[model samples]
Target chain A: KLVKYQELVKKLLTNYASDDVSDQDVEVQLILDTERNHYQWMNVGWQGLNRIYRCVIHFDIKDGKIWLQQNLTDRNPAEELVMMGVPREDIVLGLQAPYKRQYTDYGVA
Target chain B: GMDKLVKYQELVKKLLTNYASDDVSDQDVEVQLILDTERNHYQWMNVGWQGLNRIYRCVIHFDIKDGKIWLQQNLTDRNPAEELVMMGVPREDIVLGLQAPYKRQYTDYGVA
Candidate 1:
C-alpha cells in the first residue's frame, strides 16, 4: 500500500515538477487552497461551472523534513494533487466555477 | 597531498574508462587548481515553501585533444537560474528543461 501511494506521489511530482528529481525529494503537504492555486484550473475547468476548494501542495524535502526555504508558488498544485492520490475530477473541481468566481472580490473577475 | 591528487586523477580515469561512453572518452581532460568561491550562505525567514532557486556550479575541464566536455556541478537552491543563465547556457536550457544526465545536448525554456 505504501508502495502504491509512493508511486502515485512520484507520478504527481513528475507531471508538474522535474521528472529528474528523485521521489525522496518530493512531499505532498496539504495546505489552504487559495485563488492562486486555481489560476490554471479556472482557465481549464468547467468554464466557471464547478468550484474547487482545499488543495494539496508539493514540497521538496531537504535535510530531514520538507524544505521550507523555497516558496510554494514554485510548485504546480495540479501536478501535486495527482501525486497525493486525488482523482482528476476532484482536481478539476478544486479549480472550477463558483470557487474561481469567488476571487472576483480581488478584482480578478 | 600529491598522492591524493594522483589518486583522484586515477579515480577519474577509471570512471571514464569504465563508465563513460566512447564519445566521452575521446575528449581531452586536464586538471587545474583554484580557490573556492564562497557564495553558498543564505539567511531565510521561514521553513515553509517560499520559492525554488535551482542553480549549478560546475567544474569543467576541457581537453583540446578529445574535443569533449566534462563537467561536474555544485547544485543549490539559491540562484540556479541566474548563475546558469550567466554561464551562457541560455536560460531555456537549464531549468525549464534538462536532457540526459551525460549528454551535451539540451532544450531551452522560459526565464525565472
Candidate 2:
C-alpha cells in the first residue's frame, strides 16, 4: 500500500499543477518523483529584473508515513489530505513549530 | 530589436538540450531544464531524492546580461563554452564566470 499512499500525495500535489503565474513568460511546475517518494509543487521564473522562485508545497513519504514538509499558502493541505482519507496518525506536519507538534492530532515525531 | 539575442537563445537551447539525459532508470532522479527566455537565464539541473539523501544541483547555468552569455555555473566535466563556440557563438562573447578574477584573462573568452 506504499504506492497507494504515494498516489494520494501525488494527487494532492498535482491539483495545483496548472500554469497560473501572475505575469507573462513564467511557469508553475510540479516535480512528482514517486520512486523515491518526493513530491514538490513549485514556481520558477522571472518578473522584470527580479528572479522568482517559490515552492508551493513539498511532501515526502518517509518510513511509510506522509510528511507534509512545506506549505506556502494559508490553505491547509493536511486537512485536505485527511478528507482524501489519509489517517491523521499517518500524516505528519513537518512544517509545524517543533514545540507545537504535540498540539495537532497528526504525528508528533 | 534583439534578433541576435533570439538567435543566442536558440543556440543555447540547442546546446543544452544536447546534454540532457535521455534515459533515467531511477524514477526518483531527473535532469531538469530551466529556461527563462524572457529574462535570459538558462540552466540544466539534476534533482532527486533517495534513502536518507536528497540531491538538488545545477549542472550548468547561463545568464545573458550586457549582451554576452555568462557561464555562471558548471558542475560537469564537459566543455560547454567550447561547445557553444562550435555552435557558432563567438568565443569572445561568452563569459567564463565560473573562473576566478585573474584566471579568465588568460583564456581567449570574455572576462566580464
Best candidate, lDDT: 2
| Candidate 1 lDDT tens digits, B50-84 | 12322211222111101111122222333433443
Q: Give the CAPRI rating of model 1.
A: incorrect
The top-ranked prediction according to TM-score is: 2
Once fitted onto the true fold, the runs of candidate 2 whose alpha carbons sit more than 4 angstroms away are: A1-109, B22-25
Q: Candidate 1: which stretches are off by over 4 Å?
A: A17-75, A82-109, B1-70, B75-112
Could you tell me which 10 consecutive residues in candidate 2 chain B have the lowest summed lDDT?
Answer: B47-56
Number of clashing residue pairs, candidate 1: 19
How many pairs of residues in model 2 come into backbone collision?
Answer: 0
Residue A11 Cα positional deviation in candidate 1, in Å, after optimal superposition: 1.0
User: Whose DockQ is greatest here?
Assistant: 2
lDDT of 1 by residue, A14-77 (tens): 4433332223212221221121111111000111223221113332221222211122355555
Model 2 per-residue lDDT tens digits across residues B63-110: 676778877676678898998888888888897766644566788798
TM-score, chain B, model 1, is 0.22
